[PDB]
Amino acid sequence: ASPFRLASAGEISEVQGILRTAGLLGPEKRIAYLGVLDPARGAGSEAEDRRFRVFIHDVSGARPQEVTVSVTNGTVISAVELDTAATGELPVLEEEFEVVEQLLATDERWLKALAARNLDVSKVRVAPLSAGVFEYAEERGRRILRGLAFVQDFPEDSAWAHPVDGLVAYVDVVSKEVTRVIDTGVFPVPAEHGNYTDPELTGPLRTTQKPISITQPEGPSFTVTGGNHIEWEKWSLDVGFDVREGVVLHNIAFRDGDRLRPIINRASIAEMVVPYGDPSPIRSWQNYFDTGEYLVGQYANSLELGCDCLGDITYLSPVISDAFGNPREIRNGICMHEEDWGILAKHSDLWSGINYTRRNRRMVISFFTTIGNYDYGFYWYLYLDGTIEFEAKATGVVFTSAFPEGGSDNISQLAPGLGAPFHQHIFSARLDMAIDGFTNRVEEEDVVRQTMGPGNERGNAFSRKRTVLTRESEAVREADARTGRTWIISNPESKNRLNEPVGYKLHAHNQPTLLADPGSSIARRAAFATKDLWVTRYADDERYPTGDFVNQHSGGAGLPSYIAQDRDIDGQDIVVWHTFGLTHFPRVEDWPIMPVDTVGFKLRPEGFFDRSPVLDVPAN
Amino acid sequence: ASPFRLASAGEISEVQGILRTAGLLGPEKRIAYLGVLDPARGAGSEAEDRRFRVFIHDVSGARPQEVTVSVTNGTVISAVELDTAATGELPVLEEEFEVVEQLLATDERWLKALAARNLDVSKVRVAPLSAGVFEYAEERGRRILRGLAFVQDFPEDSAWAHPVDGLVAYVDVVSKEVTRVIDTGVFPVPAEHGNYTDPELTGPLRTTQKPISITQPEGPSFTVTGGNHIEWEKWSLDVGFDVREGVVLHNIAFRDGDRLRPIINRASIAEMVVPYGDPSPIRSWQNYFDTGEYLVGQYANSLELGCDCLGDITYLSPVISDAFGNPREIRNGICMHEEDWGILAKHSDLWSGINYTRRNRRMVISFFTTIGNYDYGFYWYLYLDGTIEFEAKATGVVFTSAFPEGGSDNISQLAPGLGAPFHQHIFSARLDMAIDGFTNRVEEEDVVRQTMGPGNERGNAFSRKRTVLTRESEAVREADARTGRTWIISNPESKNRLNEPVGYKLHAHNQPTLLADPGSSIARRAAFATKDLWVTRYADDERYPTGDFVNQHSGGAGLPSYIAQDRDIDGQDIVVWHTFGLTHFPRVEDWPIMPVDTVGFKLRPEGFFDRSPVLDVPAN
Ligand SMILES: O=CCc1ccccc1
Ligand SMILES: O=CCc1ccccc1
Ligand SMILES: [Cu+2]
Ligand SMILES: [Cu+2]
Ligand code: NA
Ligand code: NA
Ligand code: NA
Ligand code: NA
């Protein structure tokens, strides 16, 4: 009955039938995105209308369409033809991954480049990479992918160990033309294999690890009702799933006495970008938006009990659409479990004689996605004490190149002849805030150092200052680790028992933001990534920091366009966008398969409760 | 047989007998510090000599002494009379904690101040706080403690809820005189209790938490030999314990093939300081050095199975001396166990069809200490992939004051009338490095942004730069989160298979350092805390960043004095000192007992291995 329930196979079958009957899903059409729309603000009228947004691609060159359908009424609500030169191309289709390799395999220029290298075309894998927007006027309005080549010596070989540097091709995947083949010279193809399951490389496997057994003899402490409504240790929320964003959290709230208090209306990772810092023309165009261009949710892994998720695991199996509108289940695509998290609070008192210890725990909601060489785990954590934390785990295989004789300032060496270009992994969290309701404000909090003098005669005092962000034009903020900068989201109309506004404090990791020159193409297309924090006024159609159609969009869409409206955000329905990322100078230890590295953020209560909220936790 | 074994009860009994026979331990003497000395550099002569350093206090006013004894030869090696006005007072004795309350209880000025407040002297607890060095000329060369008062309504009451503001006393604990009683005015004593085990405050305890069972059916994967030598998943180390520093790690090394490769010779938390930022004269002198002034190791808790440490736990029970030279066991004072740590590495490859997942784990070595209101957990972590991490967990009860009518810029309100002054918790990790041996250097690594232009026509390139620190005068470094600043400790004479120096990268949390005015007393006594990183040349007697005798020392001792020698550190036996801390603006949720907050640092291999070191981990 909940409007926030996961999409069902039946709903997706209905969408397909509706589009087919309307003449919108003929043999030349492909569904490039399908997703359920969130209820509009103020859905307290009990009028459920399950609506789906669809992006429809046409493989014969006709204009794509954006379509909204209602499955409750079985109708097409709206249907719009898209001018992709203006508003951007549609996301990459899975079925296009192989088209780039296949088109190059018959192009004379491609074949001549491989022949000069004595490479058999049947052994050459081509990575299908997004094109971006650069200097090539012939690409405007066309659907372009760029291809970089890797050799697979045998079917089970890791191609990433054998990059073919000095060579790149551009392909129009709709007209099926190879527009350019660029060959800047021959590099040796690195010869060592990178097969991390080969006994020659691993040596004998360790026999020293004894098992760790994690069980819950009475089952887990959380309940799931309605398919995706979670209640755990006074928390409640709905777990959604979208093919673009992946796991989405709705209606995060905390049961404080008899009051269910909202905290966050919608939480998601709304974009991610991986910009490469190698100035070689073979790769200087390389920036992929895994969320916006490829849709991370459709590549979610099926997670294996005892390997990917350990303990008493409850699974969700979300349903998405394939390119023809058929429902497809991602079996065991979301793990949910609780974890012990050490000591929560502890004190031994010299005067009362009381010794007190309580243990902490967290609820874990996670999925894993794979797009080409990279793999990412997305983890949401809820803690007993009201903290909310997000963590990204990056692993997989680093993207490789040749390592040039004489070295490089932008590439590190991993093995003889084998390089890995410098790059970043940058995420955008979209936090539709609802601290005790929708009237919220953001304050920037800095430490204040004080001068020794009158009123501070011993020079020990220090303080803090809070600046309210009142309009969107002043709500584009930078981190400052040196001054301990944080941001507080408060409700000025809801006060704690000390008559102070209730609030939550956002703690960032203060990692570097986008490094590229501010005049670059990527700085214009990923403008969100140049600043740590943005605050906008909520609006239904302002969903992604990069806009709706990221692929081959020329720039400026999303957050820079939103904040130009300069809307009031002081005690209003607001959205926080936090940029956070890893800057990756690859090390030898990242090869041939990368141990996990992590980045994230957390929010902690800041006078939201009237005292510690975990006084009622038992001794265990 | 190991020279790094824990001190035994028999060794401490021998020290006592040796000091007694030498005439050094009469009835007026107290042992204020006793600890085993580390083997000198180059102990490859097989000549074991177990030596102990002792600080001897005299309760009758005679000069204290520093004494070194050899238990192997049963002799006093050296004995030096200390001039405490010059070099600092001895650490606070546990038996002095109660002397301050007892002396004030008969002082007419103290009694008049309590009578004006209608407080019964039998209900007034007095916190024994270290004095520091300020403007009081009469305190030079005397052993002073300062007292702040708290009311206990009944024997099991939490006194911290009832601070008596506007009142402070100074006491000479050797001559047993109250030197000053300062009363700046009457504040209401906050009335609400803070008894976090009272059902009136906790409400009914949750019944919703189901048990989590963590077991190791075949036992743990690590072995302990010789009392304190650990081997775990190619790591080996010795776990030491010192009454001042707490847990100390010796000879951290990693078994790479057939070679045992050293990484860190000695790791410890060598100092910590809690400076308060309240300019009230009642508290503007308040800075305690828990390690240097109070000795955190002697207040280590006994850790309870299933409450403090969960899983298959192996305990160590270190032995220390009491004030009379008797051995005293800290039963179960150190927990050791391994923990599952999620995914280690994962990749699903589109071209090879191979799906690969491995799980991570870490070894945990921890102890907990309690000094007055504050409790701290110290956690050392070793990971499968070569990472070393330290984590401090801060909990307990915040130090309180009145909250003034009309508010405060330096105190936050926790309850009606109840304040908590702003303060920091700052730690110093001393890392005696030994990356593949003792010839080490430190490089500072910054991200380098590049301008769009020739050689970077698309404005995407970025790079990094490394600066070698060659002498101590240039090795006092500040964090820079914006440029992703890290520090690399490398061995220029030991190269990986790519002919690059092996190394480890130190990742800091980049939290604010000491906030106090640089002309303050605390900035001079805790000078280490004003900078994030220091590098010194190793020397036997350069143990603490604050010097040997922190209590009432006038300033400048330790690191600022060491680095003035301006010694060569480029490919030498070096020591890294990393400052890291929490800046604490207390929140309502910290009251009446604080949920854990954390800070720390980690070191990751940086071309130390020839490839990932966890390729031989099995599928489980
Ligand atoms: O992450 C998207 C870029 C990509 C896609 C497919 C193969 C390699 C790289
Ligand atoms: O942490 C050392 C300061 C202190 C010691 C004893 C009681 C309260 C405060
Ligand atoms: Cu990376
Ligand atoms: Cu604190
Ligand atoms: Na355009
Ligand atoms: Na909002
Ligand atoms: Na002095
Ligand atoms: Na060293």
CB atoms inside a 10 Å sphere around CB B449: 16
| CATH code, residues B1-87 | 3.10.450.40
Instruction: State in Å: Cα B566 to ligand 7 middle.
Output: 23
A242 and A248 in contact (C-beta within 8 Å)?
yes
Residue in this structure with the two tokens 């054998």, named with its chain if needed: A162
Structure tokens at A493: 């109309």
Residue of A nearest to B341 (CA): A310
Residues of chain B with CATH 3.10.450.40: 1-87, 94-195
Interface test with B, best of A462, A464, A620 (most B CBs within 10 A): A462
Return the amino acid letter for B11: E
Q: How many residues does chain A have?
A: 620
CA distance B212 to chain A (A): 5
Of B352, B409, B517, the CB nearest to A463: B409
Distance CA A243, CA A225 (A): 23
Distance of CA A557 from the midpoint of ligand 5 (Å): 9
Cα dihedral sign for B10, B12, B17, B18?
positive
| Integer Cα distance of A319 and A317 in angstroms | 7
Contacts of B400 (CB under 8 A, 6+ apart): B150, B160, B161, B163, B190, B414, B418, B419, B420
Residues of B annotated as catalytic (active site), given as ranges: 290, 374
Q: Scanning every residue of chain B, which has its alpha carbon at the shortest distance from the alpha carbon of A301?
A: B348
The answer to whether A427 and A438 have CB atoms below 8 angstroms apart is no
A259 C-beta neighbours (distance < 10 Å), count? 9
Give the environment of ion ligand 7: residues with CB less than 5 A.
B 554
DSSP of A315-382:
EE--EEE-TTS-EEE-TT-EEEEEEEEEEEEEEE-TTT--EEEEEEEEEEEEEEEEETTEEEEEEEEE
Question: Would you say A288 is a known binding-site residue?
Answer: yes
Q: What tokens does B506 get? A: 């130190």
Which single residue is written with the structure tokens 């604010």? Answer: B512
Work out which ligand 2 atom sits closest to the CA atom of B130. 3
Sign of CA dihedral B270, B527, B529, B263: negative
Give the minimum alpha-carbon distance from B175 to chain A in angstroms, rounded to a whole number: 25
Give the separation between CA A38 and CA A250, rounded to whole angstroms. 10
Dist CA A516 CA A525 (whole Å): 12
Q: Is residue A374 flagged as an active site residue? A: yes
Rounded to 5 degrees, φ, ψ at B87 are: -105, 0
B618–A520 C-beta distance less than 8 A: no
Structure tokens at B188: 């209401």
Q: Which of B36, B35, B93, B38 is nearest to B64 (CA)?
A: B93
Residue B241, burial from CB neighbour count under 10 angstroms (0-12, 13-18, 19+)? buried
- Rounded to whole angstroms, how far apart are CA atoms A294 and A128? 11
With residue B15 as reference, give the H or E element that holds it. Answer: helix B9-21
Residue A348 to residue B450, Cβ atoms within 8 A: no
Cβ A419 under 6 angstroms from ligand 1: no
Do A378 and A366 contact (CB within 8 A), yes or no? Answer: yes
User: Residue B76 corresponds to which tokens in the numbers above?
Assistant: 């006093």
Nearest CA to ligand 2 atom 9: B372
Q: How far is CA A541 from the centre of its chain?
A: 19
Taking the C-alpha atoms of residue B227 and residue B211, their distance in angstroms, rounded to an integer, is 33
Annotated binding residue B135: no
The CB density around residue A311, as the number of other CB atoms within 10 Å, is 21
Closest CA to A326 of A26, A4, A76, A31: A31
How far apart CA B229 and CA A400 sit, in angstroms, is: 41
- Quote the CA–CA distance of A197 and B619 in Å, as a whole number: 10
Give the contacts of A489 (CB within 8 A, at least 6 positions apart): A433, A435, A440, A441, A442, A503, A504, A506, A574, A576, A603
Phi, psi of B519 (to 5 degrees): -90, 5
Q: Which part of chain A has CATH 2.70.98.20?
A: 196-619
- Give CA angle at A299 (A293, A301), nearest 5°: 155
Among residues B487, B493, B574, which one has the least CA distance to residue B533? B487
| Residue B152 and residue B159 in contact, taking contact as beta carbons nearer than 8 Å | yes
A298 labelled ligand-binding: yes
State which H helix or E strand residue B504 sits in: strand B501-508
The SS3 of residue B97 is helix
Q: How far apart are CA A4 and CA A561, in angstroms?
A: 29
DSSP state of A199: H
Q: What are the angstrom distances between the C-alpha of B480 and each of A47, A519, B477, B559? A: 53, 24, 10, 21
What contacts B499, CB < 8 A, 6 or more positions away?
none
Q: How many CB atoms lie within 10 A of CB B1?
A: 5
β-pairing, A334-348 vs A314-316, is: antiparallel
> Cβ contacts of residue B155 below 8 Å, gap of 6+?
A352, A353
With beta carbons less than 8 A apart as the criterion, state whether A347 and B395 touch: yes
Element (H or E) spanning B66, and its range? strand B65-70
A314 neighbourhood in chain B, CB within 8 Å: none
Q: Which residue has the tokens 């007209």?
A: A175
DSSP B163: B
Q: What is the DSSP letter of B305?
A: B
CB atoms within 10 A of CB A334: 25
CB A346 within 8 A of CB A358: yes
Q: Do A589 and B451 touch (CB under 8 A)?
A: no
Start-to-end CA distance of chain A, whole Å, equals 37
Residues B140 and B494: their CA atoms lie apart, in Å, by 51
Residue B53 to chain A, least CA–CA distance (Å): 29
Ligand 1 centroid – CA A61 distance (Å): 24
Of A157, A238, A242, A290, catalytic: A290
Q: What's the token pair of residue B387?
A: 């990472």
Residues 6+ apart with CB under 8 A from A61: A174, A175
Which ligand is closest to the CA of A369, given by its number?
A: 1
Distance between CA atoms of residues B365 and B250, nearest Å: 13
Residue carrying the six token digits 């640089």? B518
Burial string for B155-169 (b: 16+ CB within 10 Å, else e) reads eebbbbbbbbbbbbb
Which string of b and e fits A11-23 if b means at least 16 CB within 10 Å? bbbbbbebbeeee
Residue B385: name the closest of A588, A522, A75 by CA. A588
- Torsion, Cα A390 A391 A392 A395, to 10 degrees, reads -160
What CATH fold (topology level) applies to the domain B196-619?
Beta-galactosidase; Chain A, domain 5 (2.70.98)
- What CA–CA distance (Å, rounded) separates B606 from B503? 5
∠B316-B360-A601 over CA atoms, to 5°? 100
Output the CA torsion A478→A483→A484→A487 (10° steps). -40
Q: Which ligand is nearest to the CA of A147?
A: 1
DSSP alpha helices (H): ranges in B301-427? none
| Cα–Cα distance measured from residue B154 to residue B538, given in angstroms and rounded to the nearest whole number | 52
Distance separating alpha carbons of residues A250 and A253, to the nearest angstrom: 9
Contacting residues for B95 by C-beta, under 8 A, at least 6 apart:
B30, B323
Q: Which of A219, A461, A520 sits opposite B460 (nearest CB)?
A: A520
User: What does the buried/exposed string (b/e) look like for B266-279 if buried means 16 or more CB atoms within 10 Å of the residue's CB?
Assistant: bbbbbbbbbbbbbb
Let me know if A538 is a catalytic residue.
no
Determine the residue type at A9.
Answer: A
Kindly compute the dihedral angle of the four CA atoms of residues B155, B157, B158, B161, in this order, to the nearest 10 degrees.
Answer: -130
Tell me how far apart the alpha carbons of residues A588 and B604 are, in angstroms, rounded to a whole number. 12
Residue B466 DSSP SS3? strand
Contacts with A592 from chain B: Cβ below 8 Å: 611-612, 615
| Largest interatomic CA distance in chain B | 87
CA distance linking residue B297 with residue B294, whole number of Å: 9
Q: CB burial class (10 A; 0-12, 13-18, 19+) of residue B456?
A: buried
Contact B513, B529 (CB under 8 A): yes
Residue B282: closest C-alpha in chain A: A458
Q: Which ligand is nearest to the CA of B129?
A: 2
What's A94-195's CATH class? alpha beta
Distance from CA of A2 to the nearest CA of B (A): 24
Task: Find residue B65's DSSP bridge partners.
Answer: B56, B81
Counting Cα atoms < 13 Å in the Cβ hemisphere of A599 gives 25
CA dist A485 and B124 (Å) reads 40
Beta strands B476-477; B533-537: pairing state: antiparallel
**Cβ neighbours for B257, distance < 8 A, ≥ 6 positions apart:** none
The HSE-up count of residue A302 (CA atoms within 13 Å, CB side) is 8
Question: Which residue in chain A is spatially nearest to B337 when comparing CA positions?
Answer: A212
- Fill in the amino acid letter for A47: A
Q: 3-class SS at A10?
A: helix
Residue A369: partners with Cβ closer than 8 Å, 6 or more residues away: A246, A290, A296, A297, A299, A300, A301, A375, A376, A378
Is the separation of the CB atoms in A145 and A128 below 8 Å?
yes
Sign of the dihedral defined by the CA atoms of residues A305, A306, A310, A312, in that order: positive
Work out the angle at residue A428's Cα, subtended by the Cα atoms of residues A89 and A79, and round it to the nearest 5 degrees. 35
**What separation, in Å, do the N-terminal and C-terminal C-alpha atoms of chain B show?**
37
Q: Interior CA angle at B569 toward B563 and B574, to 5°?
A: 85
Out of B277, B481, B592, the one facing A510 most closely (by C-beta) is B481
State whether A462 and B593 contact (CB < 8 Å): no
Residue A227 gets the label, from left (phi > 0), alpha (psi -120 to 50) or beta, of left
Q: How many residues does chain B have?
A: 620
Report the distance separating Cα B536 and Cα B513, nearest Å.
20
Q: Are B547 and B555 in contact (CB under 8 A)?
A: no
Given a contact cutoff of 8 angstroms between Cβ atoms, the answer to whether A508 and B537 are in contact is no
Please give the structure tokens belonging to residue B219. Answer: 């036992």
The vertex-B364 CA angle with B359 and B365, nearest 5°, equals 165
- Give the Å distance between the CA of A421 and the centre of ligand 3: 9
Distances (CA, A) of A478 to A3, A172, B599: 37, 39, 22
Segment holding B35, helix H or strand E:
strand B29-36
CA dihedral A196, A202, A204, A205 (to 10 degrees): -50
Reduce the DSSP state of residue A530 to 3 states and report it: helix
Is B299 annotated in some ligand binding site?
A: yes
How far is it, in rounded angstroms, from Cα A248 to Cα B310? 33
On the question of a cis peptide bond just before residue A199, with omega within 30 degrees of 0, the verdict is no
Question: Could you give phi then psi for residue A591, rounded to 5 degrees?
Answer: -110, 140
Selected for mutation to probe chain B from A221, A443, A458, A522 (highest B CB count within 10 Å) is: A458
Q: Which of A275, A360, A588 sits opposite B609 (nearest CB)?
A: A588
- Name the closest ligand to CA B88: 7
CB A565 within 8 A of CB A472: yes
Contacts of B522 in chain A (CB under 8 A): 460
> Which two structure tokens, joined as six digits, stand for B523?
């900035």
Out of B213, B368, B618, name the one closest to residue A217 (CB). Answer: B213
CB contacts of A301 in chain B (<8 Å) are 348
| Distance of alpha carbon A415 from alpha carbon A87, whole angstroms | 43
CB contacts < 8 A, A to B, total 433
Helices of type H across B93-223: 97-104, 108-116, 199-202
Of B585, B593, B416, nearest to A606 by C-alpha is: B585
Supply A346's token pair.
């502890």
The Cα–Cα gap between A566 and A537 comes to: 9
Residues 6+ apart with CB under 8 A from A52: A7, A11, A15, A34, A35, A36, A37, A68, A69, A71
Asked, as a colleague might, if the bond just before A275 is cis with ω within 30 of 0, I would say no
Q: Is B276 annotated as a binding residue?
A: no
DSSP for residue B244: T
CB-based burial of residue A541 (10 Å sphere; 0-12 exposed, 13-18 middle, 19+ buried)?
A: exposed
**From the centroid of its chain, how far is CA A529?**
13
Q: How far apart are CA B74 and CA A250, in angstroms?
A: 71
- Say whether A588 sits in a helix, a strand or coil: helix
**Phi and psi of A149, rounded to 5°?**
-110, 145
Burial class (CB in 10 A: 0-12, 13-18, 19+), B307: middle
Beta strands (DSSP E) in A23-88 are 29-36, 51-58, 65-70, 75-81
- The conformation of residue A211, written as its DSSP 8-state character, comes to -
Our CA angle for A304, A305, A311, nearest 5°, is 145
- Interface test with chain B among A134, A447, A460, A614, by most B beta carbons within 10 Å: A460
